[PDB]
Design a protein around this ligand. Structure first.
Ligand SMILES: NC[C@@H](NC(=O)C[C@H]1CNC(=O)c2cc(-c3ccnc(F)c3)cn21)c1ccccc1
Length: 273
């Protein structure tokens, strides 16, 4: 019933995460994305309410689904002899944040504020649903160019949220915290806040602040573009070497730089159209 239900379009991307194709749901013409992942390549397995062994991404995406549009929606999934296929809602027109930044350079602060705020709302929703993403980065954020809404994608490195230490990690290394680099140990929320600091620097400077393990461990931030004192302060706080020196999500969103965010539609009108 997979090839019956969907018309497959072009390949959108492929890499460590699998292969993702553009698609259309035949029944009603809904734009979709079709993600294929080989069974051998699946690092983390989970189990459904009725106890079926699936990729962790399937478990996690079901835990987050609801009216909220900050996280990509899982529409369906299929098992094959050597692979799983995931059907995801696809915004149209769309561009990932990595490509958007590559083309436009460093983002104006007003725009970064709107985008960052929306990423924070999406991550908070994940956590509230018991889900930890573990790979927050520009490549995992899609921009709905008409409505100015961002969507978090790719939960294939994620895990159930817990309060004890994680000792496994398969997300993106240059967004990973110094405690992972040094000790192979981290806690969920504080590691997430570190990756959010990396992301915010990326938005306002047009590139990530650290390339090497030694730079992550030193944690010394240098600004290559003109960035406001308040934005610099928030970034440096997110990037505190000691996990307990990092702000809570509440503290980030109450920070002075985060006041007076634009609504998504205002953001599209001013910055995207
Ligand atoms: N290099 C850009 C490419 N990114 C990926 O394929 C990343 C891939 C990583 N892992 C995923 O789970 C995943 C889902 C999607 C996706 C999801 C929903 N709509 C889309 F258009 C794309 C895309 N991803 C992309 C091209 C065109 C539109 C969107 C994205």
């Amino acid at each position: 019933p997979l090839e019956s239900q969907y018309q497959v379009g072009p390949l959108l991307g492929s890499g460590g995460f699998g292969s993702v194709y553009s698609g259309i749901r035949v029944s009603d013409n809904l734009p979709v994305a079709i993600k294929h992942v080989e069974k051998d390549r699946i690092s983390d397995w989970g189990e459904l309410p009725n106890g079926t062994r699936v990729p962790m991404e399937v478990v996690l995406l079901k835990k987050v689904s609801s009216g909220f549009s900050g996280v990509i929606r899982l529409l369906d999934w299929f098992e094959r002899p050597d692979s799983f296929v995931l059907i995801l809602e696809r915004p149209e027109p769309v561009q990932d944040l990595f490509d958007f930044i590559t083309e436009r350079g460093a983002l104006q602060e007003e725009l970064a504020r709107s985008f960052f705020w929306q990423v924070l709302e999406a991550v908070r929703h994940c956590h509230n649903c018991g889900v930890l993403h573990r790979d927050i980065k520009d490549e995992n954020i899609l921009i709905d160019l008409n409505r100015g809404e961002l969507k978090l994608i790719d939960f294939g490195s994620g895990a159930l949220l817990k309060d004890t230490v994680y000792t496994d990690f398969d997300g993106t290394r240059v967004y990973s915290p110094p405690e992972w680099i040094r000790y192979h140990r981290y806690h969920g929320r504080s590691a997430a806040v570190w990756s959010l600091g990396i992301l915010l620097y990326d938005m306002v400077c047009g590139d990530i602040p650290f390339e090497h393990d030694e730079e992550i461990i030193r944690g010394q931030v240098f600004f290559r573009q003109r960035v406001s004192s308040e934005c610099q302060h928030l970034i440096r706080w997110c990037l505190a070497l000691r996990p307990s020196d990092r702000p809570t999500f509440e503290e980030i969103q109450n920070h002075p730089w985060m006041q007076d965010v634009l609504l998504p539609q205002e953001t599209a009108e001013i910055h995207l159209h």
